[PDB]
Amino acid sequence: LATTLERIEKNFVITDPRLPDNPIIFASDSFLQLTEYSREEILGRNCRFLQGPETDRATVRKIRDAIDNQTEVTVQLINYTKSGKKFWNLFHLQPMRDQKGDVQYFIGVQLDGTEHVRDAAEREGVMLIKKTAENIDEAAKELIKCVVVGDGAVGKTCLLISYTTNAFPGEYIPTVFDNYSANVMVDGKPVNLGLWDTAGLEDYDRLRPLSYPQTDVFLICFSLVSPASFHHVRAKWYPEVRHHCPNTPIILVGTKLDLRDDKDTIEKLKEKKLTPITYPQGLAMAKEIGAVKYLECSALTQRGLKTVFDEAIRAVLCPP
Numbered sequence: 001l002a003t004t005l006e007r008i009e010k011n012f013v014i015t016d017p018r019l020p021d022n023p024i025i026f027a028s029d030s031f032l033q034l035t036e037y038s039r040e041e042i043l044g045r046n047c048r049f050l051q052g053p054e055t056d057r058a059t060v061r062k063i064r065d066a067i068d069n070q071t072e073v074t075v076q077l078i079n080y081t082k083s084g085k086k087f088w089n090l091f092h093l094q095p096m097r098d099q100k101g102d103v104q105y106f107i108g109v110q111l112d113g114t115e116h117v118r119d120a121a122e123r124e125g126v127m128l129i130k131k132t133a134e135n136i137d138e139a140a141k142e143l144i145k146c147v148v149v150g151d152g153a154v155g156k157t158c159l160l161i162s163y164t165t166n167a168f169p170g171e172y173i174p175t176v177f178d179n180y181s182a183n184v185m186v187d188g189k190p191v192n193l194g195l196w197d198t199a200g201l202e203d204y205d206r207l208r209p210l211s212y213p214q215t216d217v218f219l220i221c222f223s224l225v226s227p228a229s230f231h232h233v234r235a236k237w238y239p240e241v242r243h244h245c246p247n248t249p250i251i252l253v254g255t256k257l258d259l260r261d262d263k264d265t266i267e268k269l270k271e272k273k274l275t276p277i278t279y280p281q282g283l284a285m286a287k288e289i290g291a292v293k294y295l296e297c298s299a300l301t302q303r304g305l306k307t308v309f310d311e312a313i314r315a316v317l318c319p320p
């Protein structure tokens with residue numbers, strides 16, 4: 001079918017207006033190059049970070065008004081790179097609607113230059129960016145939406161960071177919402193996967209479901225070394241997901257696989273009169289909640305990590 005997003009060699013972002021402050025959920029390589037930001041630095045944030053001292057605030061208000069009214073707009077305004085380099089941005093914004101006809105995303109295309117353009121030059125630029133926006137809209141239809149839920153501190157953010165950047169973040173900072181992207185080869189075909197990271201904390205219960213509409217697959221995560229997090233799969237995560245999304249495939253993911261055989265961890269659990277969750281126990285839970293797959297992984301060693309996302313995609317593309 002249609003091209004994937006990574007083949008569109010233009011500056012653009014896609015945002016999710018259902019989440020607080022309409023954050024970026026996809027950014028093109030060209031946009032990264034233009035703006036000097038890393039992908040993780042800007043995914044999960046509102047695009048206003050591009051603005052600065054010389055930006056015309058009236059023009060910014062036009063953009064806000066268009067977003068609020070869910071209509072397209074085309075403007076020119078001064079923006080800045082991460083290092084403070086000024087550029088002119090011939091900017092086009094348009095809503096992307098789902099099958100029903102409701103707004104699902106906003107698409108924004110930037111044509112960068114060194115001055116405000118007019119007459120013929122303006123007309124040419126506007127035509128180019130509008131065409132680009134239409135190509136993005138077609139390609140974005142196949143963006144797979146995967147939402148990751150589970151208790152606080154089970155490793156949701158670490159596994160996303162490990163998978164998408166091969167690093168390990170370490171120092172625990174609780175998440176509100178954040179987003180990650182991956183282009184994954186599945187049976188020799190490129191697939192764009194969007195990953196919505198969410199807050200495990202119960203006090204975020206009223207916000208979390210803002211991420212749920214139009215989800216293609218859920219990963220419900222629990223730590224293999226926290227029996228409480230495992231029990232919460234049955235008591236909390238499964239029922240919450242099913243309440244909003246009765247028919248969406250779930251993959252059950254056991255995290256921190258590397259700690260299941262860790263001597264200190266086993267000893268600490270023993271002090272609490274507990275033991276790690278075993279593979280057979282995790283599998284039985286998966287069957288209980290009707291998960292299409294049960295998988296184990298470590299963000300630290302990356303063991304099993306690739307398979308998680310490969311199977312998330314297959315759960316959507318290859319539904320038996």
Ligand SMILES: Nc1nc2c(ncn2[C@@H]2O[C@H](COP(=O)(O)OP(=O)(O)OP(=O)(O)O)[C@@H](O)[C@H]2O)c(=O)[nH]1
Binds near residue numbers: 198200258300
């Ligand atoms: N040994 C080991 N530690 C891990 C692994 N994954 C996460 N951790 C540790 O667990 C802590 C919590 O990880 P996070 O990914 O931030 O937890 P979270 O699930 O995103 O928590 P919330 O954002 O609050 O919902 C991290 O500080 C890591 O040090 C892992 O695979 N192996």
Ligand SMILES: Cc1cc2nc3c(=O)[nH]c(=O)nc-3n(C[C@H](O)[C@H](O)[C@H](O)COP(=O)(O)O)c2cc1C
Binds near residue numbers: 079
């Ligand atoms: C799809 C999308 C792309 C955007 N791209 C830019 C951009 O390239 N440059 C910019 O200055 N603002 C951009 N914005 C506008 C800001 O995100 C924000 O909507 C604007 O600053 C007005 O809202 P605010 O007053 O709350 O900041 C974009 C918005 C969306 C929805």
Ligand SMILES: [Ca+2]
Binds near residue numbers: 040044045178
């Ligand atoms: Ca981010």
Ligand SMILES: [Mg+2]
Binds near residue numbers: 156157158174197
């Ligand atoms: Mg997190």
